[PDB]
Symmetry: D3
Subunit: 152 residues, 6 copies
């Protein structure tokens, strides 16, 4: 398993697609321990047409979704390594989300960095927690438990 | 007590594709609100969540509950006031105790049920559930702060 | 009942022109009852009209045609995804359409279509579009099913 | 009252906007009588993503909508002339549609020409009828009644 | 063939919405020139931002359409109408030069691309020509591309 | 006239809007001389749906557009400073493009940096030239001439 993955590899692992694939690159990855990835934020995103007019703010809930997708990638690769064929048959689902705090608004031009760490994992159940960061500052924090389920 | 999309557009600053509340069916100042958003396949979000298997994002269910809560908090203090609405902004500080029990799909009428857990000044704490046809599909607690726009 | 996943296996239409979310009643060569939810979160509302969301009357008719199409596919070949994936549908005629009440975000647009006449791939249906029991539209139409190529 | 109008003139009269403004140019207009206009059809339009995958066919219902908007422009300018200030607070509701027949499929690269004639009009209620044409051939026929109304 | 419609264009170019800017090919002479076009309609997403109340087809996209037309010419010159082989090739555009914009392009216009082969040496193809609207030159440009395996 | 502007400032100066506003932030600006700006590239952009499926590549022509917008922002602030009121009465027309080279493909996760210097300028006619950079490496080169015009 490698520690750097680009959009080409992310597409083979996650089932998410436009406009809900919110992870552009993975810069760090340690099986069963953690992942550091990021998503660039540009004004050229449909979401900003409505959030908000003349005041582009990346939705806090989408920041969380981004953290979870990172967590999902970590959970899957920790178990099966980089396996596109099997990834194609699994899908990660949100079971819970706790302790979410928004500290700083995210705006176009920002590099939304996801920092997730494994709090607990047994089989298909994974509990991850971490933060979203912009140039070293914590813009958000969150904890969530996900499940690796069958796609079919 | 019953507000339609037009009224909603005058209170919330959210616009397409992030205004996730279609109609308000109940509102008791400082107490509770019941509102909903219809889920249809004709939504852009379904192109990627997911291809060949449409599932309304859990995070968007939460966003929907927040918007309902913020509408509750705002109207409770200022009522249906478009003019004042433009001078205030309701952003969320925290979100806690979120649980997803059932997937929401095209055809569902996603109903939001939020009650004011507590409020002090401009800090409001709401909580409740997301319901589809009488069943709880999600639940969450949120803390919001009402501030002056700008 | 047939859900979005099932509808997708039969109708060729896709986003943003698939306007039927669920089928509630189906009786071969007789009639069909289905619906589509209307939410503000639809791209059409950006232009129809700004600050005044009104589902286009022509899309209500499209939704009725698609409902009729699903009735046609299944009456002809049953629920067969394999044969379905080779076909598309063309509108032939539209007639006697009347709009009585505007459809807006929050509405559950229900389609009620019955077979008026059919032969081969050519089907003629008629009925109404309803929101909470009240007729919001009436229409008759004839459509043709044809091979992708 | 001119006889040729361009997209900028159409935007000041019709309340329709993207993705439902289906008239690109008006080539000839006779008040309270007839109007000829057209909309270019390109693959670069969102409806094609879903109608149908791998086989782009401009929706018949949108051709009717286009004929309706051509009628609406005719109807409005016949009433108040070319007045954007009066126009900016009006909308147009479809009332009835009759005897529409589609003869030829419309596809990308086509110049969809609308020919509408006023069959009967009273106040805000206009009943127009005509055809949609591509390269001189009739691809569609339709009769419709629309109402112009003040937004409230 | 000499006249290719959208269905054919789709089988040769990998470009898809909203970046497939060639609707139909009207003339094609292997290794010499290609005449094609793209209709310009207000119902295009690009006009939402370029520019509000003043729809003007982006000049860079006129050049993109010309580049796409050059690629179809190059490709069809090597293998003709071959969808299967098309899936295994890519046309990288290396340079763009001498482009001049003389007349703005707007909704209602039939943007016609006129490109000819200026030089073909190996995997490198150099094309140049003009974009026209109703007989008049609206733009001109030269482009160099390389053929390679996808 | 400062040297750093964020999206809220770019919105008030450039007339470009979604999905054609391709500059997210300004980092360096010397009136009548040079400018350095950037646009974050994310998979979450509609343009990638068609360029190309299963292989996101930011269109070379859009990189040039991005450089033009940066130049236009330089030009306008050079002649009027940060004046939203006057900016609202203008648009920009591409006049020529020359010497463009695409050396490295741009993909999601990249920080597309625009470097432009003023080659020549008189009245509303500005001629800039420079490069587009990603992590210090030249990804593209171009020279272009634009004109600021009264939107009449
Ligand atoms: O993270 C945020 C902190 C404060 C704030 O006001 C805010 C906001 O208004 C919108 C999104 C995020 C934030
Ligand atoms: O990758 C391609 C880019 C442009 C283009 O024109 C093209 C093509 O015409 C055939 C195969 C691949 C490509
Ligand atoms: Cl937010
Ligand atoms: Cl979900
Ligand atoms: Cl209507
Ligand atoms: Cl059709
Ligand atoms: Cl331009
Ligand atoms: Cl490119």
């Amino acid at each position: 398993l490698q520690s750097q993955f680009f959009i080409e590899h992310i597409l083979q692992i996650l089932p998410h697609r436009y406009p809900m694939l919110l992870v552009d690159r993975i810069t760090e990855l340690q099986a069963n321990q953690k992942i550091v990835a990021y998503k660039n934020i540009t004004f050229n995103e449909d979401v900003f047409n409505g959030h908000f007019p003349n005041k582009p703010i990346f939705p806090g809930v989408l920041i969380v979704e981004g953290m979870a997708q990172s967590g999902g990638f970590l959970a899957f690769t920790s178990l099966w390594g980089f396996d596109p064929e099997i990834a194609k048959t699994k899908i990660v689902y949100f079971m819970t989300i706790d302790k979410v705090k928004f500290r700083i608004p995210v705006t176009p031009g920002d590099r939304l960095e996801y920092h997730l760490e494994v709090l607990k994992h047994k089989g298909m159940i994974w509990q991850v927690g971490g933060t979203a960061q912009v140039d070293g500052k914590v813009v958000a924090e969150a904890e969530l438990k996900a499940m690796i389920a069958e796609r079919e």
